[PDB]
Structures are given as structure tokens and as C-alpha cells.
Amino acid sequence: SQFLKEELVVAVEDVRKQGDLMKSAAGEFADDPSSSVKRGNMVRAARALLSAVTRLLILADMADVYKLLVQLKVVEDGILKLRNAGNEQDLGIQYKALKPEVDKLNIMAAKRQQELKDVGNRDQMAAARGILQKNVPILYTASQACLQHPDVAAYKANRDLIYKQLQQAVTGISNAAQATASSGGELAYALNNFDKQIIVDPLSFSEERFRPSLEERLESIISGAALMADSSCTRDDRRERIVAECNAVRQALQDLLSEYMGNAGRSDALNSAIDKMTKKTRDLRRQLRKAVMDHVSDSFLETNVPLLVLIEAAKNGNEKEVKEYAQVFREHANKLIEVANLACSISNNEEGVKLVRMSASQLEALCPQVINAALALAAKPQSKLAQENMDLFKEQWEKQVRVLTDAVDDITSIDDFLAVSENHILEDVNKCVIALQEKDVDGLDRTAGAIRGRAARVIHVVTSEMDNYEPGVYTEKVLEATKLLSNTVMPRFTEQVEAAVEALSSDPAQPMDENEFIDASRLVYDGIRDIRKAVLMIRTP
Amino acid sequence: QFLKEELVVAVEDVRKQGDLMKSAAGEFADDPSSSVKRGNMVRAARALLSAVTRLLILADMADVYKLLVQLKVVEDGILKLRNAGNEQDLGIQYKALKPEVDKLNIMAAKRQQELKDVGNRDQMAAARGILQKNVPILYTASQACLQHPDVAAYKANRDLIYKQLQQAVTGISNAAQATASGGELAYALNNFDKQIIVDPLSFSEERFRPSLEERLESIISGAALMADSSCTRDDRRERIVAECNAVRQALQDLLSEYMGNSDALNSAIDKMTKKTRDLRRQLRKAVMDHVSDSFLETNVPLLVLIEAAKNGNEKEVKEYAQVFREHANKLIEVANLACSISNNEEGVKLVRMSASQLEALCPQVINAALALAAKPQSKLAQENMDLFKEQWEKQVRVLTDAVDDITSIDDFLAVSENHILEDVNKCVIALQEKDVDGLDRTAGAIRGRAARVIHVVTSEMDNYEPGVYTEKVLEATKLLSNTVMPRFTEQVEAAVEALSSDPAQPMDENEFIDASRLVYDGIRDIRKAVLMIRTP
């Protein structure tokens, strides 16, 4: 940092000389507000002084990058040392001297991130700083669990996983800072392309052998749409409708194909075909929206349930049940990630797609860590620190699930969720009244749980999409309907269901009032519908 | 000019900030090792930079407004120059215009070199060049519309020039205004080659497919413009399509290889760079293809139109105007194509400026033919056609030598040698088949391409300074011109004489083939001589 200092003093002397020149020229113009020459000399000095100041400030930029490289190498060595800890005394010291350098690095890297220009590097820098700050205090506890219970290898796997993520964050900072030289969804991009790429006459030899076949674009679009509609998370309803829409958007293209193949005239018969094609593409767009809303309303319930089953089986020292429920938990996490990926696919917003994919990837990286933490707790169940690790990883899991949930909420339309959840909760209150009408205790319990979960989901979604607007009268009425369904309708419905289940599962079968139960169910539905209409007022399209 | 108030505001601001920065820099240099004083120096430097950049953008906006007012002045003065009724009033409006038009041209040059864009730069350059070259032409068009008020051709020409100047001033307005954002296709091609790789480990399959696929498709469109062109050989565009499919396959292969991560995937990247370089070479070969194949006959439709308009035919001169327009468009195509792939930025600017100038000049010669066919006896028709043909041939050779200086000479020599070998075999086989039109056309083509070679090597050997390398190739070119073309034109005309007559005598076919192999070997020899610069 010495050559930089000398050349920076050089540049600052340059800048002071230019400032003297600029002051002289400006004082000379200040006398003649009319001389087009004094004005010319003023601007000619301004440009050169601006160039000199720019030289100096880019020297300062290079100096800050120089400092950040060695700070990053310092924290790299510190991470390597905190990993290679011997006992809880050397480890407890490596942390009391790494946090200062970690914080200095984080601040300098935020500075350099604000100094960047390319936004991909901005986000790489932000994610690297975030992973750094999240994993250093977690690498501490992982190394502590390694050194206290060295008999379990799951702790070693977690220590090494967090160390690898930390080194990846180090290298990400390095490249996002050093490299100073120089966005919608996948299905939405191709859908808008195919919407616009059907306006040219392809009988010519200029866009039938160079540009892609207007059939191949549709075929890859169908590949994506049937990838979504074949997901294990898709209902049969959306699947049938997506099949219908794919076969109706291939018929509107074959109609358009036989319209452009026989025209080749610079025509009107093909305007009907292009309008039909536009409308069929818009309809398949809407159907993919309906399918992803199906996914959001369905799979985003019982969010932290496999985790709870896993930790409850791991609190009891079990080993094979832990592996079974851990494979199940990995599967459910991958189900969440697949749903988030489909919703990222059909989405147009550039920022939301990035947040969704990044949060889902972080949750995917967290999945094996909490699996190993549950395994290591079950391996040493009568341990304090294993219990603490399990608690920490369960809280991390709940937080990551909540942030992925909010990302998918904000990346999608509010009233679409309102309507799909309204119809689903109607189907479910019907399932509930039916399970009661035949005294099906299991069906009644399951359906009431589904109804309550969907209600709480809708309340969280409505309160999340209600903060995007200013505190006003519309928000007042909407949040009033929300808290009314909150503190009234759902507790009443729950008490009704509990009374019915108690009346069924008793030594004397008690004839509960079947009338008020149905009233609480229809109250759930009508509250959902009321809130839906309340949110559906401040917009006209 | 009412903004000078904010100017003095920003001047006082910049003075205060510069004094503050000089004080802070003195504090730093007096204590060269202080994290606080250095920080304050940098803070003051950034504040001073913000102040002087505010001042700079204020000055640029003042520049822009004064240019807008000058442009409105020139526009209204041109409106006066067109509607002038007297030659006295036309002279007075031109007297009041010429300095104001020069002022507008200088200001437009300033705001062109100060444009934050690279394309609107060229647009306004061409527009103000049109305004620079056509106002003195509107003067004479109006003088000849006020001196022959009967011939509607003179009025059509005057008003065509007026509409062109109005397009020029509106273009200057639109270009210098909206600064809101090498060559057309070469830029995207080199940036494709820049974006082929980024980061192996943090590589997402759904974050780079848009960039790479869309870049590939834009490149494919830019190359299809050149391959599927009015003047580009069939085999050439088939070769281009082959290389386009190859580069598409290579892009998809590079995508499927970046799906696996950074070891064995280097081969896919090398194949990608190979395919993009080979497509670059095929496009350059296509440009060189329609250079020798289109620049050999420059004044043909002009000459035929001039003769058929001097004779006064109406239908003939109209068909010749259409062939003249087809020729001008066929040449503008080659201009834009050779521009879109060259990295010589200033050369591209010059070529495109000359190309738009000639594009505007074409309908002027059209209306000159209009004036000649309608009044062939009239005194002013001769001078009108003479001026416009002079300007036309001037701009033709200007665009020729302008594209010559963005086109590598060695590729020109290669494509010219292969093309004249092709035409010489055509000529031989037409002499053995005894085709009078065949020999006529083939000898014309060979002689024209040889003259093309002569002109390009003459215009290229002046960029060097006379030495052994200079004279060694100058001798070959002089030998070609003053030896083989005589001995070839002589043989082919002896053929068309003895064959297209009664005796049908064998026109000494061995000497004919001797002259043909002579012209091939002479072009090849000039090539071999001038190619003694470097090997890598």
C-alpha cells in the first residue's frame, strides 16, 4: 500500500494545481457574465480539474480494494484457524480475535459493494457478506460440538459443510471486489417472446433457417408447462387443464401454420389466426398461474411439521427412525424448493425471482445440516450441547422457511391466492361437514386442521400484502376483516370441532348439535370471502 | 441564455468546495499518515467532484439549448430560402444562411463529440453532413426553379432537397436531444466472446441461458442479414448457414458442459471460441465476396440513364431511374454489411456518413434525368446533369475508397484471385463453346475486376513510403495493367471479331489461353509480392 500512497500524493498535487487553475479561471469569468471566452476557459479548466479529481478518486478506489484483499486473506486465515481448533480453549480464543477482523471485513466489503457498478457483482457481494456473518458464529458452535462430542461424525460433516460455505463466501467476496470490469423468469421470458415472435412471414429464407422454428419455441414451452403440471405437487385439476391448454395452443399454432403457409402475401385471413394464438398463449399463461397458486395454497401448510417429527424422534435416542424421518424431511424440503422453483419460473418480476431462488438455495443447503444435527442429537440424546445444536438448527429452519414463504408471497398476486384459497377452503369445509355427517372422527380432525392452517396462511398473506400499501382507510377495513376472522371465527370453529370430536370419542356417544358446527364452518368460508372482497376494492383491473 | 444565473451559482459552489478540498489536502499532505485526514481529503475530493460535475452538466445543457435555437434559426432560414421568389431574394437568403449554417454545423460537431452514445453520434454526423452538402444544392435548385417555372422537374428537385434538409434538421434535433440510453454486429459478436464464460462453481443453468441464447439469436439475425442478401453468393450463404448451425450446436454443447459444475469443460469453451471465430471468418469472407463482385461497375446505370435522358425518352428514363435506385440500394447494402462487422470505428463512421450522403444524392440525379428528358434542348439541363453526375461519381469513388480502408487488402486479393480465376474459366469455356455474349460479358468482368485490383493496390500502396517493398509490388501492378490487359483485351476482341464474322477462324486459341493464364498469374503475382510483410 506504499506505491499507491506515493502515486496518490502525486495525484493530489495534480488536483491542487488544477484547483488553482480552476479558481483563477472562475474568478476571471465571474467578472464577465457575457464573455464567451472567459466562459470557455472556465469550462476548459473544469473538465481538466474533474479529470484530475477522477484520477485521484480512482486511486483511492484501488487503495480500498488493496486493503480489502488483505483483510479477506486475514479473515480466511482466521476461519482456517477457528476450524482447526484443538480444545474449547483455543477455539474460545480464535473467536475473540476473529470477530473484530470479520466485522472490519464486512464493513469494508459493504463499502466496496456500494463502490461497484455491475449489479450481479453487487448481489454476489451481498450474499457473500451474508453467508459470512451467518456462518462464522455457526462455525464456532459447530467446531465446539465437534470438540465436545468427537464420537459423532455428523458434527464433523456439519463443521466441514459450514467451512466450505465460508470459503465459498470468501472467494465470492474476492471476485466480486476484484473483478471491476464489464432478468425475468424462464417461462415468462419465452412466453412473451413467443407472443411477439409470431408477427413475421416465415415462408421467407431469412427466418426459417436462421431463426428457430416457431414450432420448436412452442415445443420447449410445452416442455416447461408439462414439467410444472407433472410435478408431484400438482392437483389433477390443474394437470387436466394444462393438458387442454397445451393441446389448444398447438391447434392455434397449426391453424396459424396453415394460415401463413398458404398466404405469403404482403393479407387478412391470418390476423384471426394471430389473434387466436395470442389468446391461447394468454390462457396458458393464466393456467400456469392457477397451477402455481394451487401449489402455494396447498404445499405451504404444515410448514415445520417433518422437522418436528424428526426432532421428536431424535430426542428419544432413536437411530433408524431418525434416518427414515430425515429422508422424509429432505423430501419435503425438496418439495418446498420445487414449488418455489415453479413459482420462480412463471414469474415476471426480476427482483422477486432472485430472492426466491436464493432463499430456496440457502434452505436447500440448510437441509442436510439440520438432518445431521438431528442425527447427532439422537446419537448423544443425554447431552446439553447436542440439544442446543438441534434447537439452533430448528430455529434456522423455521426462519428460512418463513423467508421463502414471504418471498413466494410477494412474488405472486395477492387476490389469486385469495380466490384459490377461498375455493380450497370451501372444498375443505365441505369435506369437514361430510366427515361429521358420517361421524368420521379422523376425517373431521384432519379437515379441521387443514381449514385452520389455510386460514392462518391466508391471514399471514393478507397482512404481508397489506403492508405494501400506505396506512389508510382501505387497509383499515381490510385488516379489520382480517383480525375479525382471526380472533373470532377460527377459535369458534376450533371449539366446535373439539366438542364434536369429544362427543364422538367417549364412552357414551353424545349427540352434539350438528347445526352450530355447520354454522362455524360457513362462518370460516364467509370470513374468507369477506376478506377477499375487502382486498379486491382498491383496484379495477 | 437565461441559465447563467445557475451558472454563477454552481461557480461559487465549485469555488467553495475546491477551497475546502485544497485545505483538506493540505491537512493530509502535512500529515501524510493519518486515516482521518486522508479520509477527509477523499471526502472533499468526492464533494468537489460532485460540485464540478453539476457545473459541467449545467454547461452541457446550456450548449444544448443554444444549439436548439440555432437549429430553429437555420430551419426557418431554409424555409425562407425555398419560398424565395426572386434570384435577388434567393441570394439574400443564402447570404444570411451560409454563416448560420456553418455555425450550426460546428455546434453539431461539438455536441456530436459530446454525445454519450456511439450510434446517435453517427446519425447526427450524417444528418449534419447532409445539411452541409445540400444547402448549396438547394440554392441552385431554387435558382433553376425560379428561372424555368414551367418545368416541374426543377420544382420537384428543389422540394426534394428541401424535404431532405428538413429531415436533416429534425434528425439533428432528435439525435442531439435524446442522449437517453465499433460496428453493429461486430460489437455484439465480440461481447458474446466476452460473455462466453463468467464463473464455474457459481454457475446457474437458469441465470445464463437468457444471456447466451439471446446473444446467439441476435448474432444469428445480424449474420442472416448479410448471408441472405441481394448480393451475396449462394455457396457463401450456405457456408454461413453451416457455420451458424455449428455455432448454435457449440453454444448448446457449452451449456450442457456448464451443467456439470471446471476441468474437462475447457474443451467446450475452446470449441465455442472456435465456432465463433470461424463464423467471423465466414462473414468477413462474405463481405469480401460482394466487394469484388459489386464494385467493378460503378457508372453503368448512371451512363445508360444519362444517355436515355439526353435523347429524351420517358419510359426508358423511368426504367433507368428504377435500375439506378436498385443500384444505389445494392451499394448501400454492401456499405452497411461491411460496416456491421468491422472494428474500425472511425472508418465505419466515415463509410456510413458517405453512404447516407450518396443515398440522398440518388433521387437528385433521378430528378436531373427528369429535367433532361423533359427539356433536352434547354440550356440549364446540361449543367444540371453535369453537376449531379460529377457529385455522383465523386461520392461513388468516395464510398469505394472508404470501404477499402475498413476492408483488409489481403482478403480482397484472395477473393479477387479466386473470382477472376472463375471468370477466366468461364471465358475459356465460352470461347470453346463459342459464346459471343459469353466472351463479351466474361472479358468485361475480368477487366473490371482487374481494374478494381489496380485501384485498391494503388490506394493502398500510398499508405506506405517508397522502398524495396513498395517498388516490388508497384512493378507487378504496373506490369499487370500495361502488359496483360492489353494482351487480353486484344485477344478477346480478336475472338469476337473473327468468330462473330464470316470466316469463323480458330482465333489462335493457344494465345488466348496464354493471355488468360497471364491475367490470372499476374493477379496472383501481385498478391505474392505484396504479401511479404509478416507471417503471423
Numbering used by the authors:
A (entry chain B): 83 to 264, 274 to 357, 361 to 635
B (entry chain A): 84 to 264, 275 to 354, 361 to 635
Provide passages from the article that reported this PDB entry.
In epithelial tissues, the cadherin intracellular domain binds to β-catenin, which in turn associates with the F-actin-binding protein αE-catenin. Specifically, αE-catenin functions as a force-sensitive structural switch that displays two-state catch bond behavior: it transitions from weak to strong actin-binding states between low (<2 pN) and moderate (8 pN) forces. The structure of αE-catenin comprises a series of α-helical bundles organized into three main regions: an N-terminal (N) domain that consists of two four-helix bundles (NI and NII) that both binds β-catenin and mediates homodimerization; a middle (M) domain consisting of three four-helix bundles (MI, MII, and MIII) that harbor binding sites for vinculin and other protein partners; and a C-terminal, five-helix bundle termed the actin-binding domain (ABD)18,26. The interactions of αE-catenin are allosterically modulated by binding to its protein partners and by mechanical load.
Therefore, we determined the crystal structure of the αE-catenin 82–883 dimer at 4.0 Å resolution without dehydration, and also examined its structure in solution by SAXS. The ABDs in αE-catenin 82–883 crystals were disordered, and the protein is extended in solution, demonstrating that the disorder of the ABDs and the extended nature of the molecule are not due to the absence of the first 81 residues. Superposition of the individual protomers in each αE-catenin dimer crystal structure shows that although the N- and M- domains have similar structures, they assume two different orientations with respect to each other due to differences in the N-M interface formed by the NII and MII bundles. Cysteine labeling provided evidence for this coupling: upon binding to E-cadherin•β-catenin to NI, C228 in NII becomes significantly more exposed in αE-catenin. C228 packs against Y237, which is directly in the interface with MII, so changes in its exposure may arise from changes in the NII-MII interface. Murine αE-catenin has 12 cysteine residues, which the crystal structures reveal have variable levels of solvent exposure. Mass spectrometry revealed variable levels of mBBr incorporation at the different sites that correlated only weakly with Cys side chain exposure observed in crystal structures. This may reflect dynamics of the molecule in solution vs. the conformation observed in crystal structures. Notably, Cys 324 and Cys 337 in MI, which have limited solvent accessibility in crystal structures, label strongly; this region is also proteolytically sensitive, indicating that MI is relatively unstable and flexible.
